[PDB]
């Protein structure tokens, strides 16, 4: 049999929506079954970019392993990795977040320029995902990331995009008037993926080294 | 007033189903449907919707006027192409009546710069939008320029807009997004638009005089 998720969709599974188990990962599958538009998916409001393409890349997989690409405790010594929690992603009653992403916050009164990189040494294409937070007010921007005019840049041999966050009051969705966009890419072996941000970045904690197959879809 | 199966956003933006209505000139509250089918026909997120909901709750004088005439306000751009399948009207593509989706004119989208002074003796409600194309192909096809910007500025408002090109999940056969903003222009103030693309200009504005209190039903 291939995969199966149940209460969650692919988005909630790949991101680590704390309501779906993140660890029932079979090493291989031919197709995927799920509820596409699901209750538990992207808990913090926003849009998943290139989401339909990511579903096809994850439809048929021969080898699938998750690994802590950026260790939470050691990768971010000048930023706060323990304060990134929201009521839109609840768990056992308290607030929670995605198991595979870390919402970085300034440490004290400073958010120094972040620059982290990973080289693909797993021998296969690694699936890397990251988010971009768009606060609701400039007060949130100063309280989370200190700096006012920030930017995020993600660079690799097969990808390049610079992110400018927009501070605006979006309609209240799941008790959040700000938005967070989710992005993903595939890093070929030997290629180096780079992250460069002065704020608003939702860094990855777990990546996915994988080997894809041809065809398949979603049921 | 009571606006049937439309919402505030679709009514103030002028969704094709809400339709150009004569409407009243004064009201104390607004009767909406819990969930309305015709809101924003092109996908997006209405910024400060709750703020605008309360400002429009009680109005004593309400008069809509063509702030930027569709015919002569945009000579250097194309004002008669901005229709979409996400905003259909009777089996054909359409758009909001109060907004104009400006597109390049040939192989050039010159720098846009339009202004309006409020000579109506009362605060005027202006609304506009920034289109975020799905792919770089649409960015070149619609506005020619790759790296664009929008700047909306008055004496009580100042913000620059940087469109982001990305493939959002398909909604109403659209993978791009379009946000909608709005500001009030005090009498005597001058609102100024400056953009090189991705700007959904205003066609009809609303000179109004508000009242205190009220909400939505």
């Amino acid at each position, epitope marked *: 049999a291939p995969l199966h998720l149940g209460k969650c969709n692919i988005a909630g599974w790949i991101l680590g929506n704390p309501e779906c188990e993140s660890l029932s990962t079979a090493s291989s599958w031919s197709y995927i079954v799920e509820t596409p538009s699901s209750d538990n998916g992207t808990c913090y409001p926003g849009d998943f970019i290139d989401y339909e393409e990511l579903r096809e890349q994850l439809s048929s997989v021969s080898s699938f392993e998750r690994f802590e690409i950026f260790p939470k405790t050691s990768s971010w010594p000048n930023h706060d990795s323990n304060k990134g929690v929201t009521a839109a992603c609840p768990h056992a009653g308290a607030k929670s977040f995605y198991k595979n992403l870390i919402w970085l916050v300034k440490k004290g009164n400073s958010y120094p320029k972040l620059s982290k990189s990973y080289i693909n040494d797993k021998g296969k294409e690694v699936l890397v995902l990251w988010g971009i937070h768009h606060p609701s007010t400039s007060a949130d921007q100063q309280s989370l990331y200190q700096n006012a005019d920030t930017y995020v840049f993600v660079g690799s041999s097969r990808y390049s995009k610079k992110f400018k966050p927009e501070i605006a009051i979006r309609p209240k969705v799941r008790d959040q008037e700000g938005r967070m966009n989710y992005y993903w890419t595939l890093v070929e072996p030997g290629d180096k993926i780079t992250f460069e941000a002065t704020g608003n970045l939702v860094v990855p904690r777990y990546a996915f080294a994988m080997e894809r197959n041809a065809g398949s879809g979603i049921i | 007033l009571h606006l049937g199966k439309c919402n505030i956003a679709g009514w103030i933006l002028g969704n094709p189903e809400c339709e150009s209505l004569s409407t009243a000139s004064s009201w104390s509250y607004i009767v909406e449907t819990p969930s309305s089918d015709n809101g924003t026909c092109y996908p997006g997120d209405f910024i400060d919707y709750e703020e605008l909901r309360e400002q429009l709750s009680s109005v004593s004088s309400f008069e809509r006027f063509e702030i930027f005439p569709k015919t002569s306000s945009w000579p250097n751009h194309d004002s008669n192409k901005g229709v979409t399948a996400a905003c259909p009207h009777a089996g054909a593509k359409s758009f909001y009546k109060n907004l104009i989706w400006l597109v390049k004119k040939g192989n050039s989208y010159p720098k846009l710069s339009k202004s309006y002074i409020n000579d109506k003796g009362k605060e005027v409600l202006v609304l506009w939008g920034i289109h975020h194309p799905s792919t770089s192909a649409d960015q070149q*096809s619609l506005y020619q320029n790759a790296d664009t910007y929008v700047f909306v500025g008055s004496s009580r408002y100042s913000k620059k807009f940087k469109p982001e090109i990305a493939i959002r999940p398909k909604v109403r056969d659209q993978e791009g997004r379009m946000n909608y903003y709005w500001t009030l222009v005090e009498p005597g103030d001058k609102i100024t638009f400056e953009a090189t693309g991705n700007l959904v200009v205003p066609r009809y504005a609303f000179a109004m005089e508000r009242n205190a209190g009220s909400g939505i039903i």
Partner: antibody
Amino acid sequence: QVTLRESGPALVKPTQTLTLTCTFSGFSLSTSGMCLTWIRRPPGKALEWLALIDWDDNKYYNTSLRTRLTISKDTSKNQVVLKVTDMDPVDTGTYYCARMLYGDLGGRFDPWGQGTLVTVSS
Amino acid sequence: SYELTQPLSVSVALGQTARITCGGNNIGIKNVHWYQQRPGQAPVLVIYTDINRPSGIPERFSGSNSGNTATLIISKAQAGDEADYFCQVWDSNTVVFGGGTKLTVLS
């Protein structure tokens, strides 16, 4: 300035495999919303679409001819390849290489290559 | 699949207005593109997404789309307008071409 050129007029024997190479310039295939397409026109006959490849290496095919078609992009240099297995005399005609621009605007073809003549004969 | 239907041939007097139709079920909400193929040459896009005219295409080329019928309008029909015209949509991850219409200029 965009330039699309096909790879040489061909003579293919029946049941053999045709291989067409499209070289392009003036734009990058990795740009969002850029695709390359093979469209043929036989004598008489309306336009017939074959295969398409987009900026993310995804591949779409004429579903009536899926088993015979294979499209791919050369990892080196700006080139696209189309392989059509066991050709029939009905597969004779001009094969065009054209860029397809994709977006919420529709999926259209501009520009087109000058076309190459493929003749299936013994 | 999705059916696009054009007439086989359309004829118009010189200097008049030609109208080539492209039928489709609820085609008014779909993005239609028109391509011109003069005898012996490659196709060229003359009208994309219903009404838009690319650069260099003469002004007499126009297009409309509503209901179940798309239409390519060529005012002041010239002798050089004799060609084959094909409507096309990208629908359900598949190109869809119309049968094509040979336009002849009478007189």
